[PDB]
Amino acid sequence: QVQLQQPGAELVKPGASVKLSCKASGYTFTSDWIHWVKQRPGHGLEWIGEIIPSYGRANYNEKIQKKATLTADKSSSTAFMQLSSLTSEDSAVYYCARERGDGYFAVWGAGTTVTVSSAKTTPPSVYPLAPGSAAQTNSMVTLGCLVKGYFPEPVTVTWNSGSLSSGVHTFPAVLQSDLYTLSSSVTVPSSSWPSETVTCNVAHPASSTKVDKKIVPRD
Amino acid sequence: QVQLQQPGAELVKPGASVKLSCKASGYTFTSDWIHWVKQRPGHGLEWIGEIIPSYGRANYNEKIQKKATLTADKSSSTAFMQLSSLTSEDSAVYYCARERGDGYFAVWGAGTTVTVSSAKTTPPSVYPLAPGSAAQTNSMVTLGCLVKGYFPEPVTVTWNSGSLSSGVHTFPAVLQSDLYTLSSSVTVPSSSWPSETVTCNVAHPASSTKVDKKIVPRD
Amino acid sequence: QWRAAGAATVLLVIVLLAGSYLAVLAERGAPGAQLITYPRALWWSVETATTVGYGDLYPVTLWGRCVAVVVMVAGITSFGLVTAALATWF
Amino acid sequence: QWRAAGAATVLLVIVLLAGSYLAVLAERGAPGAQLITYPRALWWSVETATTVGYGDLYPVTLWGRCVAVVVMVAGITSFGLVTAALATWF
Amino acid sequence: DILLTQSPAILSVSPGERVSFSCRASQSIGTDIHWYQQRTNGSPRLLIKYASESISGIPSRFSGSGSGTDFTLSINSVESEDIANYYCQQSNRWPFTFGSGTKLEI
Amino acid sequence: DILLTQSPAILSVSPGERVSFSCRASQSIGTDIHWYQQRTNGSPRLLIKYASESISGIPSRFSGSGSGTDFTLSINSVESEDIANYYCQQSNRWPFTFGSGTKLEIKRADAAPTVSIFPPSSEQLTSGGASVVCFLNNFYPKDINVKWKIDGSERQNGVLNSWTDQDSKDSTYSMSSTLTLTKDEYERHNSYTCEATHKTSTSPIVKSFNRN
Ligand SMILES: [K+]
Numbered sequence: 001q002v003q004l005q006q007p008g009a010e011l012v013k014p015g016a017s018v019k020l021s022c023k024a025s026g027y028t029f030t031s032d033w034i035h036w037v038k039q040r041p042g043h044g045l046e047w048i049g050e051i052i053p054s055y056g057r058a059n060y061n062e063k064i065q066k067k068a069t070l071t072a073d074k075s076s077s078t079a080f081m082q083l084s085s086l087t088s089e090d091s092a093v094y095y096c097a098r099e100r101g102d103g104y105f106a107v108w109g110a111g112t113t114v115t116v117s118s119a120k121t122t123p124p125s126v127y128p129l130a131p132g133s134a135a136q137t138n139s140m141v142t143l144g145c146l147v148k149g150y151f152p153e154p155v156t157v158t159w160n161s162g163s164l165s166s167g168v169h170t171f172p173a174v175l176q177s178d179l180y181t182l183s184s185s186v187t188v189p190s191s192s193w194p195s196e197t198v199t200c201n202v203a204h205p206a207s208s209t210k211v212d213k214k215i216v217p218r219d
Numbered sequence: 220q221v222q223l224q225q226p227g228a229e230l231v232k233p234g235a236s237v238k239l240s241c242k243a244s245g246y247t248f249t250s251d252w253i254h255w256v257k258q259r260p261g262h263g264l265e266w267i268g269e270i271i272p273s274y275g276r277a278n279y280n281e282k283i284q285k286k287a288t289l290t291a292d293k294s295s296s297t298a299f300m301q302l303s304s305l306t307s308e309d310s311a312v313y314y315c316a317r318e319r320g321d322g323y324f325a326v327w328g329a330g331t332t333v334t335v336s337s338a339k340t341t342p343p344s345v346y347p348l349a350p351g352s353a354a355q356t357n358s359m360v361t362l363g364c365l366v367k368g369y370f371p372e373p374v375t376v377t378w379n380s381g382s383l384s385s386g387v388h389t390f391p392a393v394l395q396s397d398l399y400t401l402s403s404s405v406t407v408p409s410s411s412w413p414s415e416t417v418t419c420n421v422a423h424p425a426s427s428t429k430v431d432k433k434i435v436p437r438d
Numbered sequence: 439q440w441r442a443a444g445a446a447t448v449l450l451v452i453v454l455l456a457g458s459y460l461a462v463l464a465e466r467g468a469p470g471a472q473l474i475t476y477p478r479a480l481w482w483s484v485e486t487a488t489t490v491g492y493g494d495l496y497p498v499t500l501w502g503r504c505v506a507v508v509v510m511v512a513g514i515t516s517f518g519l520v521t522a523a524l525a526t527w528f
Numbered sequence: 529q530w531r532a533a534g535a536a537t538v539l540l541v542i543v544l545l546a547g548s549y550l551a552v553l554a555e556r557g558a559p560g561a562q563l564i565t566y567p568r569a570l571w572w573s574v575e576t577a578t579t580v581g582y583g584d585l586y587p588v589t590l591w592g593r594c595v596a597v598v599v600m601v602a603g604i605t606s607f608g609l610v611t612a613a614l615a616t617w618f
Numbered sequence: 619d620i621l622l623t624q625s626p627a628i629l630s631v632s633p634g635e636r637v638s639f640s641c642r643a644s645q646s647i648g649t650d651i652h653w654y655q656q657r658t659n660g661s662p663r664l665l666i667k668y669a670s671e672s673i674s675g676i677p678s679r680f681s682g683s684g685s686g687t688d689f690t691l692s693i694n695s696v697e698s699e700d701i702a703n704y705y706c707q708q709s710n711r712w713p714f715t716f717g718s719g720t721k722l723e724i
Numbered sequence: 725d726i727l728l729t730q731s732p733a734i735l736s737v738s739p740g741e742r743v744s745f746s747c748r749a750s751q752s753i754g755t756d757i758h759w760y761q762q763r764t765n766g767s768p769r770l771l772i773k774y775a776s777e778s779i780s781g782i783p784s785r786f787s788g789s790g791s792g793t794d795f796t797l798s799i800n801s802v803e804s805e806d807i808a809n810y811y812c813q814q815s816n817r818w819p820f821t822f823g824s825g826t827k828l829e830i831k832r833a834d835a836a837p838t839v840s841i842f843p844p845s846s847e848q849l850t851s852g853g854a855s856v857v858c859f860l861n862n863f864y865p866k867d868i869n870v871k872w873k874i875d876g877s878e879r880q881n882g883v884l885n886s887w888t889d890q891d892s893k894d895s896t897y898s899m900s901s902t903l904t905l906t907k908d909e910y911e912r913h914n915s916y917t918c919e920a921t922h923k924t925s926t927s928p929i930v931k932s933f934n935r936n
Contacts (some may be wrong), residue, residue: 061714562818
């Protein structure tokens with residue numbers, strides 16, 4: 001089972017501050033160190049700091065500017081990273097990982113996408129995408145679904161709660177006037193549709209909104 | 220006397236595997252390490268791995284892909300290198316050597332030429348080579364012998380069981396349609412021939428075939 | 439005589455372990471420190487305790503060196519105590 | 529008193545030798561290990577046993593370090609035993 | 619602090635081929651180098667630890683080599699599932715550091 | 725792991741001269757460097773161990789020098805028997821490693837080739853084969869060209885040449901051109917010549933023979 005649980009997203013206005021989290025599970029020792037790694041889109045991994053919950057001490061990367069303060073909570077097995085006074089620069093994905101004091105990170109968190117903007121949270125609109133009436137079909141058929149007007153990233157588009165995975169493309173969102181828009185796609189045999197129901201579960205953490213949308217043929 | 224005995228040749232089909240050997244003799248200690256070195260034609264020596272028979276442990280070169288497994292047999296004083304799933308790349312000469320645990324290889328094996336091909340073993344044809352009837356002769360005379368239609372390498376051409384060594388040239392084989400062909404040569408005084416018998420012993424390990432062929436003047 | 443020694447041997451293992459933990463705890467956060475993972479830290483404490491210390495690892499921070507002195511002292515004392523008893527017994 | 533010492537001196541040489549062999553056995557296969565030939569390994573065990581250990585050579589693998597601890601211990605104990613007896617005798 | 623140089627940044631290989639990513643340390647670090655894989659939108663994943671030691675759940679296609687300042691992560695017979703970003707990370711001296719990254723490309 | 729750089733890859737020296745091969749370590753290895761000799765088709769042979777320590781059975785012509793990262797293997801008064809590939813190998817840190825190699829190469833006095841043509845053997849003809857061989861022996865430089873004429877006409881098909889590496893008996897070179905026809909194709913041509921063009925003589929060296 002999943003060992004480090006991190007909140008998918010967190011929006012923040014410049015100058016503001018957010019306290020990320022990371023709850024553990026599985027085996028735990030007094031030799032365990034929880035680390036935090038920053039990663040801006042496109043660029044690589046950047047160590048931020050570390051903490052030893054079974055003592056509480058934390059050290060931080062001295063190259064970068066200190067914008068964090070680590071803390072832990074023995075009982076709930078949760079580590080907290082407090083990031084203060086944020087700017088566009090601080091926006092990125094932050095992973096927490098567990099290190100057995102032997103130097104390497106065995107397991108990592110799903111990471112929390114963090115966006116530093118003045119914009120407001122907006123759940124996405126999920127419209128279907130079935131072939132146009134005159135679309136001659138072949139051995140396979142392509143259906144999809146449009147996800148637009150949402151902010152900030154990210155969103156997770158699955159097909160049939162994840163049971164439909166083979167043949168799926170989720171294109172990278174594109175920003176325009178403070179709203180993101182992306183489309184996922186799925187290809188299945190022509191036969192299997194629409195007899196066999198095909199839905200696209202779409203989740204948007206920043207608004208705690210997950211939606212389903214069945215893709216049936218046009219009238 | 221010769222300390223490490225290695226089988227001159229070993230043919231192998233791609234994907235197949237061969238277990239080379241190396242039998243010792245002379246002085247032996249519990250501090251002895253037997254090493255294996257790969258050498259492709261033209262290129263230099265490549266350490267493959269090592270083993271300590273008086274314990275059985277073996278370590279392998281981590282740079283190259285592991286295609287071997289060393290083992291030893293205390294009683295018979297024989298070390299075995301198992302090379303699995305071979306390809307053209309694995310074809311080369313492999314030497315075993317003895318290291319007294321002091322770092323250098325004092326003595327080496329004759330090495331086993333290994334060829335990874337789908338081709339079939341073919342003993343060589345040894346034809347003589349005496350001067351043409353009108354070959355005016357001088358202080359010396361040149362005789363030889365043709366070795367063709369054999370596969371895979373190598374072959375060892377000696378003259379008069381090795382007693383005739385001064386004045387011998389054995390040209391590098393040339394491959395053509397899966398069969399090797401080479402010629403050795405020997406020069407002796409014009410007088411000494413043909414009164415004094417001159418034969419070329421030709422050995423082909425891959426077929427366990429050694430042949431003699433006397434070189435007398437043409438009819 | 440198996441008590442005067444046995445006792446020290448206990449303290450020794452306790453110190454070696456606690457030392458290995460406190461060193462990693464003390465050295466981390468020290469740029470260039472190499473005494474920063476448990477396993478090797480345990481090896482460090484032992485080579486120190488026995489007072490051999492090859493110098494492949496050593497502490498560079500104050501508390502690290504304070505942990506060091508305790509480990510060394512415990513070490514000398516323990517080994518000397520075991521040697522005293524082992525000698526007497528013979 | 530030539531027995532309490534003599535005995536230890538035996539064990540010492542046995543350990544030094546066995547140690548030198550086990551170290552080379554343990555360290556080989558360890559990238560960057562330098563304790564990998566018998567002669568110097570024997571020199572290593574002695575500088576360790578006497579607990580001097582200049583650090584010109586030392587083990588980097590677990591079993592190598594386990595061989596190390598035994599050599600050190602044997603060393604302290606042996607030398608301390610010989611010193612105890614040699615002192616008493618005087 | 620230790621610098622991990624990962625170059626080239628992109629590697630283009632043909633399927634089934636063997637590929638090698640290299641990581642160079644600004645100073646000798648013995649074998650305290652570790653490898654991670656990160657696929658598009660995934661989190662890092664330990665591939666090899668301590669330079670050569672394997673990891674359970676990882677294809678035997680993956681292997682490591684080197685010591686001191688020069689390290690190589692290898693893949694025998696690359697394949698679509700291997701397209702990702704590879705990073706090296708060291709734990710020799712504090713504070714741990716990361717490689718710039720190397721994108722595999724089939 | 726330690727890297728052994730051996731450069732230059734080839735060394736050209738005059739007989740009797742002194743030659744030096746150098747090996748550089750990627751890091752200080754004290755004197756844990758060892759030298760091996762390997763002649764064409766031979767196995768390696770320990771020459772010097774631990775950088776300077778000699779070895780029994782090895783000419784006093786051979787010597788070693790250096791420590792740390794720079795090592796030199798020397799030969800006083802090189803000679804034909806010394807033509808080989810030299811390698812350095814270290815045992816400072818695991819796993820042992822090898823040098824890329826350095827081929828010695830002696831430069832002697834220009835020698836003209838000794839051509840010798842040979843008719844195919846009956847033993848062979850008796851099997852429908854006809855291999856007319858020609859030997860270009862003991863020449864120098866190694867650069868040389870051989871030509872085949874059948875009944876006075878140049879032949880290029882069925883001819884396979886083979887050259888030998890420098891000889892360790894006299895620092896020379898030798899080549900083997902082999903024209904192979906069927907008994908048939910052979911049974912219908914009078915004479916076969918074999919011309920050798922070598923820097924030692926402006927005009928080619930030829931050897932022919934008629935089938936009758
Ligand atoms: K010391």
